[PDB]
């Protein structure tokens with residue numbers, strides 16, 4: 001595959017930093033006016049990470065429709081994702097409101113509530129079934145139905161209810177717990193095992209709203225996850241891994257949200273995951289169980 005040759009080429013000349021910095025230089029620049037309004041200062045976790053006005057998700061409420069989230073619509077691949085920051089103590093209600101209004105089925109969390117001794121995300125979901133959460137502001141109820149804890153990730157079945165209409169929906173929460181901030185997965189096997197788990201749940205299917213993906217800022221780890229998934233989907237459509245230009249795809253994604261993929265090594269890891277994942281797309285069913293093994297699930 002073209003990417004495989006390119007990989008060795010860059011790896012040989014050890015120029016990932018140069019390749020990565022080039023993408024940053026070419027990346028799109030669009031207005032983030034709403035995000036910067038004074039009334040929204042307390043709705044942003046990082047002053048330097050904001051959603052573009054053109055692709056930001058709007059909450060369905062007259063008061064304030066702002067939430068730090070972006071709709072990444074990949075027209076070519078035919079899949080959309082909503083990338084957002086880890087919710088703040090005051091935006092947990094906004095977060096579930098977004099999940100409801102956008103009709104999402106799954107939520108992918110790639111960070112931990114606490115990392116490097118600091119709080120990177122609010123405890124926005126219930127940890128015990130007996131203690132449901134109620135969000136007054138958005139009038140939503142959230143209950144833990146069950147959870148399947150594994151070595152490095154946990155899958156929870158949640159029940160989201162619109163207290164206004166009393167409708168109920170099943171939300172699946174996929175939590176990757178071993179992906180360090182500004183870091184990379186333990187191995188592509190571990191990452192791919194997790195991605196396919198999300199895929200097998202139907203959370204990424206077009207019959208549901210876009211899956212919600214987030215880490216702390218919603219650009220680094222979240223970008224890596226989406227880049228890998230989109231690239232695998234593309235070569236799957238054509239059944240031709242050579243037709244995928246990883247850098248072009250990343251640049252296309254960056255038209256919807258700034259700074260996707262935060263380090264040169266996260267870019268390098270992306271190449272590894274996609275090249276590895278190609279094995280499955282090309283008809284090798286056995287590698288999935290191979291990944292499950294190596295992942296030390």
Ligand SMILES: O=C1CN(c2ccccc2)S(=O)(=O)N1
Pocket residue numbers: 046049111180181182183215216217218219220221222262
């Ligand atoms: O790897 C990373 C680095 N991130 C980040 C990006 C900007 C500020 C703070 C943290 S992320 O939470 O988007 N994932």
